[PDB]
């Protein structure tokens, strides 16, 4: 097959925690982007720097697929120019982003009775991430004047915190799986095309 391995992207069994967002390089392949854009399963399919309709008529040097889980009400932060815990401390898109943000409700897989607390987000950081930066550090965050000595305590917080995905949560508090496609043009041959 010449088909790009979007099967693996969209059908992966494990999705990353957003602070540790996964990147898959896509190269040397074809895809029918309209199979994705025409899907009734993607409640978000928002492109930047390119129209979704044009994708099958474009080629790129490489494509990258970033993926992770966040709350439905945080999907709005996965866009250029946004602020909030996710855009500021977990996954940041640049102003000049060329790509598409894709999301779907994953409550059936990612919530459990009694709550699924497996997925993490970074709640505290001394500064905002730069675009496409990834911070997987676990230093105790010093929120006051007293040093933390590597230990949780007053004003001394573990910087990663659990989402609490309960099946009966209001919809925006349910888990959504996100795939961000970024389309890379270099001064080099194209390797990823439409059909």
């Amino acid at each position: 097959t010449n088909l790009c391995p979007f099967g693996e992207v969209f059908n992966a069994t494990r999705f990353a925690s957003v602070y540790a967002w996964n990147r898959k390089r896509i190269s040397n392949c074809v895809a029918d982007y309209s199979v994705l854009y025409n899907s009734a399963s993607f409640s978000t399919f928002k492109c930047y720097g390119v129209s979704p309709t044009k994708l099958n008529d474009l080629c790129f040097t490489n494509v990258y697929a970033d993926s992770f889980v966040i709350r439905g009400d945080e999907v709005r932060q996965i866009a250029p120019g946004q602020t909030g815990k996710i855009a500021d401390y977990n996954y940041k898109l640049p102003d000049d982003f060329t790509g598409c943000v894709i999301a779907w409700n994953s409550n059936n897989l990612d919530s459990k009775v009694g709550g699924n607390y497996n997925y993490l987000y970074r709640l505290f950081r001394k500064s905002n991430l730069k675009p496409f930066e990834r911070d997987i550090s676990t230093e105790i965050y010093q929120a006051g004047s007293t040093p933390c000595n590597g230990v949780e305590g007053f004003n001394c917080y573990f910087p990663l915190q659990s989402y609490g995905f309960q099946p009966t949560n209001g919809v925006g508090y349910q888990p959504y799986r996100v795939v961000v496609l970024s389309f890379e043009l270099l001064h080099a041959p194209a390797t990823v095309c439409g059909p």
């Binding site: 709550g115 607390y117 497996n118 993490l120 709640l123 949780e152 917080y157 573990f158 990663l160 915190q161 659990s162």
Partner: peptide, 13 residues
């Protein structure tokens, strides 16, 4: 729960 309430990744519990 993966941690006791207030500890670890359960600070907000």
């Amino acid at each position: 729960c993966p941690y006791v309430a207030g500890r670890x990744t359960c600070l907000x519990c």
